[PDB]
Tab-separated table of all heavy atoms in Angstrom:
chain	number	residue	atom	x	y	z
A	140	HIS	N	-10.897	-5.775	-8.471
A	140	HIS	CA	-10.539	-7.098	-8.942
A	140	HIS	C	-9.055	-7.334	-8.850
A	140	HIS	O	-8.602	-8.427	-8.463
A	140	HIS	CB	-11.016	-7.295	-10.378
A	140	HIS	CG	-10.778	-8.650	-10.902
A	140	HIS	ND1	-11.428	-9.778	-10.429
A	140	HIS	CD2	-9.927	-9.101	-11.891
A	140	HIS	CE1	-11.002	-10.843	-11.088
A	140	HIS	NE2	-10.103	-10.467	-11.970
A	141	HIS	N	-8.232	-6.332	-9.171
A	141	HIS	CA	-6.805	-6.471	-9.061
A	141	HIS	C	-6.358	-6.644	-7.624
A	141	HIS	O	-5.495	-7.509	-7.341
A	141	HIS	CB	-6.107	-5.231	-9.679
A	141	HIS	CG	-4.614	-5.219	-9.487
A	141	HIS	ND1	-3.802	-6.204	-10.034
A	141	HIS	CD2	-3.817	-4.335	-8.840
A	141	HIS	CE1	-2.549	-5.929	-9.711
A	141	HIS	NE2	-2.516	-4.797	-9.007
A	142	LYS	N	-6.950	-5.899	-6.690
A	142	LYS	CA	-6.616	-6.086	-5.289
A	142	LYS	C	-7.039	-7.440	-4.792
A	142	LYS	O	-6.322	-8.083	-4.022
A	142	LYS	CB	-7.281	-4.983	-4.446
A	142	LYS	CG	-6.608	-3.635	-4.620
A	142	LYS	CD	-5.122	-3.706	-4.301
A	142	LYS	CE	-4.410	-2.401	-4.599
A	142	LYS	NZ	-2.952	-2.446	-4.299
A	143	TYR	N	-8.187	-7.926	-5.227
A	143	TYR	CA	-8.653	-9.273	-4.840
A	143	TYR	C	-7.686	-10.330	-5.381
A	143	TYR	O	-7.360	-11.277	-4.649
A	143	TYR	CB	-10.073	-9.533	-5.333
A	143	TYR	CG	-10.590	-10.893	-4.959
A	143	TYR	CD1	-11.084	-11.151	-3.694
A	143	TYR	CD2	-10.625	-11.931	-5.892
A	143	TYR	CE1	-11.555	-12.412	-3.338
A	143	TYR	CE2	-11.114	-13.156	-5.553
A	143	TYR	CZ	-11.579	-13.410	-4.279
A	143	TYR	OH	-12.049	-14.640	-3.949
A	144	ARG	N	-7.238	-10.200	-6.620
A	144	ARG	CA	-6.300	-11.150	-7.177
A	144	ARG	C	-4.964	-11.130	-6.439
A	144	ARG	O	-4.399	-12.178	-6.127
A	144	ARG	CB	-6.065	-10.874	-8.650
A	144	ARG	CG	-7.203	-11.275	-9.576
A	144	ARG	CD	-7.030	-12.686	-10.118
A	144	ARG	NE	-7.086	-13.718	-9.074
A	144	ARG	CZ	-8.208	-14.347	-8.721
A	144	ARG	NH1	-9.361	-14.118	-9.302
A	144	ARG	NH2	-8.134	-15.260	-7.734
A	145	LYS	N	-4.482	-9.926	-6.088
A	145	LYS	CA	-3.240	-9.852	-5.309
A	145	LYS	C	-3.416	-10.475	-3.921
A	145	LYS	O	-2.501	-11.154	-3.442
A	145	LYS	CB	-2.783	-8.397	-5.193
A	145	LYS	CG	-2.212	-7.821	-6.442
A	145	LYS	CD	-1.561	-6.462	-6.176
A	145	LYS	CE	-0.443	-6.579	-5.170
A	145	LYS	NZ	0.198	-5.273	-4.861
A	146	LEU	N	-4.557	-10.247	-3.272
A	146	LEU	CA	-4.806	-10.859	-1.987
A	146	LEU	C	-4.839	-12.391	-2.062
A	146	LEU	O	-4.275	-13.071	-1.209
A	146	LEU	CB	-6.136	-10.341	-1.383
A	146	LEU	CG	-6.635	-11.054	-0.150
A	146	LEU	CD1	-5.697	-10.887	1.022
A	146	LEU	CD2	-8.040	-10.609	0.190
A	147	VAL	N	-5.476	-12.908	-3.122
A	147	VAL	CA	-5.549	-14.352	-3.286
A	147	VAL	C	-4.153	-14.903	-3.533
A	147	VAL	O	-3.783	-15.936	-2.987
A	147	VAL	CB	-6.489	-14.699	-4.457
A	147	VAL	CG1	-6.360	-16.166	-4.820
A	147	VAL	CG2	-7.929	-14.387	-4.061
A	148	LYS	N	-3.364	-14.213	-4.350
A	148	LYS	CA	-1.971	-14.675	-4.603
A	148	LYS	C	-1.149	-14.671	-3.313
A	148	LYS	O	-0.374	-15.582	-3.075
A	148	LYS	CB	-1.322	-13.808	-5.670
A	148	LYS	CG	0.066	-14.257	-6.055
A	148	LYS	CD	0.630	-13.400	-7.178
A	148	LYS	CE	2.026	-13.881	-7.581
A	148	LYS	NZ	2.025	-15.285	-8.073
A	149	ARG	N	-1.311	-13.627	-2.480
A	149	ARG	CA	-0.534	-13.529	-1.253
A	149	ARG	C	-0.957	-14.625	-0.243
A	149	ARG	O	-0.111	-15.214	0.418
A	149	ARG	CB	-0.659	-12.142	-0.661
A	149	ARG	CG	0.066	-11.071	-1.421
A	149	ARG	CD	0.118	-9.748	-0.623
A	149	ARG	NE	-1.196	-9.133	-0.485
A	149	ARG	CZ	-1.938	-9.231	0.616
A	149	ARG	NH1	-1.518	-9.890	1.672
A	149	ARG	NH2	-3.121	-8.638	0.632
A	150	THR	N	-2.251	-14.869	-0.133
A	150	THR	CA	-2.791	-15.823	0.841
A	150	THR	C	-3.311	-17.093	0.185
A	150	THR	O	-4.325	-17.638	0.612
A	150	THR	CB	-3.875	-15.156	1.685
A	150	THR	OG1	-4.947	-14.733	0.840
A	150	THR	CG2	-3.320	-13.972	2.432
A	151	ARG	N	-2.632	-17.543	-0.857
A	151	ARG	CA	-3.086	-18.752	-1.592
A	151	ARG	C	-3.150	-19.977	-0.671
A	151	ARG	O	-4.181	-20.658	-0.610
A	151	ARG	CB	-2.181	-19.020	-2.783
A	151	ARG	CG	-2.367	-20.386	-3.404
A	151	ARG	CD	-1.238	-20.704	-4.369
A	151	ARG	NE	-1.373	-22.023	-4.974
A	151	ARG	CZ	-0.528	-22.559	-5.807
A	151	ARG	NH1	0.574	-21.927	-6.189
A	151	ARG	NH2	-0.762	-23.792	-6.317
A	152	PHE	N	-2.036	-20.276	0.016
A	152	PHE	CA	-1.974	-21.519	0.798
A	152	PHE	C	-2.899	-21.481	2.009
A	152	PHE	O	-3.400	-22.539	2.384
A	152	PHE	CB	-0.520	-21.768	1.204
A	152	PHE	CG	0.307	-22.375	0.125
A	152	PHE	CD1	0.830	-21.614	-0.888
A	152	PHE	CD2	0.569	-23.726	0.110
A	152	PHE	CE1	1.584	-22.163	-1.895
A	152	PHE	CE2	1.330	-24.318	-0.893
A	152	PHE	CZ	1.838	-23.508	-1.883
A	153	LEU	N	-3.075	-20.323	2.638
A	153	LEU	CA	-4.059	-20.252	3.698
A	153	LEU	C	-5.475	-20.533	3.196
A	153	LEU	O	-6.240	-21.221	3.843
A	153	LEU	CB	-4.006	-18.841	4.360
A	153	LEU	CG	-4.984	-18.624	5.526
A	153	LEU	CD1	-4.717	-19.608	6.645
A	153	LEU	CD2	-4.860	-17.180	6.040
A	154	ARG	N	-5.811	-20.023	1.995
A	154	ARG	CA	-7.092	-20.322	1.404
A	154	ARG	C	-7.198	-21.816	1.083
A	154	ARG	O	-8.302	-22.394	1.252
A	154	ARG	CB	-7.274	-19.486	0.117
A	154	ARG	CG	-7.537	-18.008	0.388
A	154	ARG	CD	-7.782	-17.252	-0.902
A	154	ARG	NE	-8.085	-15.866	-0.651
A	154	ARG	CZ	-9.306	-15.374	-0.435
A	154	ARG	NH1	-10.360	-16.178	-0.438
A	154	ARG	NH2	-9.479	-14.082	-0.220
A	155	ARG	N	-6.138	-22.434	0.591
A	155	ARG	CA	-6.180	-23.867	0.353
A	155	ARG	C	-6.389	-24.667	1.646
A	155	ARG	O	-7.176	-25.618	1.658
A	155	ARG	CB	-4.891	-24.355	-0.338
A	155	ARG	CG	-4.595	-23.660	-1.665
A	155	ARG	CD	-3.405	-24.269	-2.355
A	155	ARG	NE	-3.695	-25.578	-2.927
A	155	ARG	CZ	-3.413	-26.730	-2.349
A	155	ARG	NH1	-2.806	-26.791	-1.206
A	155	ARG	NH2	-3.732	-27.854	-2.968
A	156	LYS	N	-5.726	-24.273	2.714
A	156	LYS	CA	-5.942	-24.921	4.004
A	156	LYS	C	-7.392	-24.766	4.492
A	156	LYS	O	-7.970	-25.734	4.977
A	156	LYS	CB	-4.949	-24.369	5.024
A	156	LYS	CG	-4.974	-25.077	6.368
A	156	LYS	CD	-4.440	-26.505	6.243
A	156	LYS	CE	-4.309	-27.164	7.603
A	156	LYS	NZ	-3.322	-26.463	8.471
A	157	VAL	N	-7.939	-23.546	4.355
A	157	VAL	CA	-9.306	-23.312	4.759
A	157	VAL	C	-10.282	-24.141	3.908
A	157	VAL	O	-11.251	-24.705	4.436
A	157	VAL	CB	-9.635	-21.817	4.699
A	157	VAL	CG1	-11.123	-21.587	4.903
A	157	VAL	CG2	-8.821	-21.052	5.737
A	158	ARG	N	-10.034	-24.211	2.609
A	158	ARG	CA	-10.903	-24.981	1.729
A	158	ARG	C	-10.843	-26.476	2.087
A	158	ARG	O	-11.856	-27.175	2.116
A	158	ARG	CB	-10.512	-24.776	0.274
A	158	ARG	CG	-11.039	-25.848	-0.672
A	158	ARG	CD	-10.746	-25.510	-2.124
A	158	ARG	NE	-11.588	-24.445	-2.618
A	158	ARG	CZ	-11.568	-23.982	-3.895
A	158	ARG	NH1	-10.793	-24.512	-4.785
A	158	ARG	NH2	-12.395	-23.005	-4.228
A	159	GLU	N	-9.624	-27.000	2.363
A	159	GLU	CA	-9.515	-28.372	2.774
A	159	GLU	C	-10.207	-28.659	4.089
A	159	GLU	O	-10.924	-29.665	4.215
A	159	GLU	CB	-8.039	-28.764	2.846
A	159	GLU	CG	-7.797	-30.232	3.258
A	159	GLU	CD	-8.307	-31.204	2.269
A	159	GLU	OE1	-8.388	-30.881	1.061
A	159	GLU	OE2	-8.660	-32.344	2.660
A	160	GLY	N	-10.086	-27.758	5.049
A	160	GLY	CA	-10.765	-27.901	6.316
A	160	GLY	C	-12.266	-27.880	6.159
A	160	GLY	O	-12.969	-28.674	6.817
A	161	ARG	N	-12.804	-26.991	5.328
A	161	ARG	CA	-14.245	-26.935	5.119
A	161	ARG	C	-14.742	-28.155	4.367
A	161	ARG	O	-15.834	-28.656	4.670
A	161	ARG	CB	-14.611	-25.674	4.359
A	161	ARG	CG	-14.487	-24.388	5.210
A	161	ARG	CD	-15.070	-23.176	4.522
A	161	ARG	NE	-14.303	-22.771	3.354
A	161	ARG	CZ	-14.622	-23.057	2.098
A	161	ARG	NH1	-15.711	-23.737	1.821
A	161	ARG	NH2	-13.828	-22.610	1.098
A	162	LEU	N	-13.973	-28.677	3.401
A	162	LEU	CA	-14.378	-29.905	2.735
A	162	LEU	C	-14.338	-31.090	3.701
A	162	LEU	O	-15.169	-32.002	3.565
A	162	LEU	CB	-13.457	-30.183	1.542
A	162	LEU	CG	-13.608	-29.231	0.361
A	162	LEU	CD1	-12.723	-29.671	-0.804
A	162	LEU	CD2	-15.038	-29.120	-0.070
A	163	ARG	N	-13.434	-31.104	4.651
A	163	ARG	CA	-13.413	-32.165	5.662
A	163	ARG	C	-14.710	-32.173	6.457
A	163	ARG	O	-15.355	-33.230	6.619
A	163	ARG	CB	-12.213	-31.968	6.591
A	163	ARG	CG	-11.647	-33.254	7.161
A	163	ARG	CD	-10.631	-33.854	6.241
A	163	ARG	NE	-9.572	-32.873	5.902
A	163	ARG	CZ	-8.493	-32.656	6.663
A	163	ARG	NH1	-8.295	-33.310	7.783
A	163	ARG	NH2	-7.596	-31.746	6.267
A	164	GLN	N	-15.129	-30.996	6.951
A	164	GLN	CA	-16.399	-30.900	7.667
A	164	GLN	C	-17.577	-31.229	6.789
A	164	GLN	O	-18.561	-31.803	7.274
A	164	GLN	CB	-16.523	-29.495	8.272
A	164	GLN	CG	-15.472	-29.141	9.299
A	164	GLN	CD	-15.559	-29.999	10.547
A	164	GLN	OE1	-16.593	-30.560	10.860
A	164	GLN	NE2	-14.436	-30.087	11.258
A	165	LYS	N	-17.539	-30.829	5.503
A	165	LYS	CA	-18.602	-31.175	4.589
A	165	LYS	C	-18.766	-32.687	4.426
A	165	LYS	O	-19.852	-33.207	4.493
A	165	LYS	CB	-18.342	-30.501	3.233
A	165	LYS	CG	-19.471	-30.495	2.259
A	165	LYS	CD	-19.071	-29.738	1.008
A	165	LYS	CE	-20.235	-29.568	0.059
A	165	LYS	NZ	-19.885	-28.753	-1.127
A	166	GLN	N	-17.645	-33.380	4.251
A	166	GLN	CA	-17.664	-34.838	4.159
A	166	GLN	C	-18.164	-35.480	5.433
A	166	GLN	O	-18.960	-36.429	5.415
A	166	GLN	CB	-16.304	-35.372	3.796
A	166	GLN	CG	-16.248	-36.877	3.591
A	166	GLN	CD	-17.045	-37.325	2.370
A	166	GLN	OE1	-17.207	-36.575	1.397
A	166	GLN	NE2	-17.545	-38.560	2.416
A	167	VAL	N	-17.714	-34.958	6.587
A	167	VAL	CA	-18.177	-35.518	7.855
A	167	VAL	C	-19.667	-35.312	8.076
A	167	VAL	O	-20.393	-36.195	8.533
A	167	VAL	CB	-17.351	-34.893	9.029
A	167	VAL	CG1	-17.943	-35.316	10.352
A	167	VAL	CG2	-15.906	-35.326	8.939
A	168	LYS	N	-20.153	-34.124	7.686
A	168	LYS	CA	-21.586	-33.848	7.791
A	168	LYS	C	-22.375	-34.754	6.858
A	168	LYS	O	-23.468	-35.246	7.248
A	168	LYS	CB	-21.868	-32.377	7.459
A	168	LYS	CG	-23.336	-32.014	7.451
A	168	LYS	CD	-23.521	-30.548	7.021
A	168	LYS	CE	-25.005	-30.232	6.851
A	168	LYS	NZ	-25.780	-30.534	8.103
A	169	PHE	N	-21.913	-34.986	5.629
A	169	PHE	CA	-22.584	-35.944	4.755
A	169	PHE	C	-22.604	-37.329	5.327
A	169	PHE	O	-23.623	-38.027	5.254
A	169	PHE	CB	-21.904	-35.942	3.367
A	169	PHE	CG	-22.525	-36.883	2.389
A	169	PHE	CD1	-23.782	-36.651	1.880
A	169	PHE	CD2	-21.836	-38.003	2.013
A	169	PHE	CE1	-24.354	-37.497	0.993
A	169	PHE	CE2	-22.418	-38.887	1.083
A	169	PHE	CZ	-23.671	-38.644	0.587
A	170	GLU	N	-21.472	-37.779	5.914
A	170	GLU	CA	-21.407	-39.107	6.524
A	170	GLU	C	-22.420	-39.229	7.675
A	170	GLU	O	-23.133	-40.225	7.768
A	170	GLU	CB	-20.009	-39.384	7.023
A	170	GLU	CG	-18.965	-39.533	5.929
A	170	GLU	CD	-18.986	-40.891	5.273
A	170	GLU	OE1	-19.652	-41.810	5.820
A	170	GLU	OE2	-18.332	-41.075	4.233
A	171	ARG	N	-22.483	-38.198	8.525
A	171	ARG	CA	-23.441	-38.248	9.628
A	171	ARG	C	-24.873	-38.157	9.160
A	171	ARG	O	-25.741	-38.812	9.756
A	171	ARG	CB	-23.164	-37.103	10.610
A	171	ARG	CG	-21.799	-37.210	11.310
A	171	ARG	CD	-21.821	-36.593	12.693
A	171	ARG	NE	-20.561	-36.616	13.335
A	171	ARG	CZ	-19.710	-35.604	13.358
A	171	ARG	NH1	-19.987	-34.444	12.794
A	171	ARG	NH2	-18.541	-35.727	13.996
A	172	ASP	N	-25.162	-37.368	8.131
A	172	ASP	CA	-26.512	-37.349	7.578
A	172	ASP	C	-26.936	-38.717	7.025
A	172	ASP	O	-28.055	-39.151	7.251
A	172	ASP	CB	-26.613	-36.266	6.467
A	172	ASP	CG	-28.021	-36.062	5.990
A	172	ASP	OD1	-28.975	-36.491	6.673
A	172	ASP	OD2	-28.203	-35.475	4.910
A	173	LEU	N	-26.028	-39.392	6.321
A	173	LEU	CA	-26.301	-40.723	5.840
A	173	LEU	C	-26.468	-41.704	6.990
A	173	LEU	O	-27.371	-42.579	6.909
A	173	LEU	CB	-25.202	-41.200	4.892
A	173	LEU	CG	-25.151	-40.522	3.525
A	173	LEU	CD1	-24.539	-41.455	2.495
A	173	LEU	CD2	-26.530	-40.058	3.048
């Protein structure tokens, strides 16, 4: 758990970018499904 927390702290902004990119595709997929 400590190593995972340190990894998250080190790569916080990359994780935020990945989350934003995945949410973009999620929204696009919802729009296309509708």
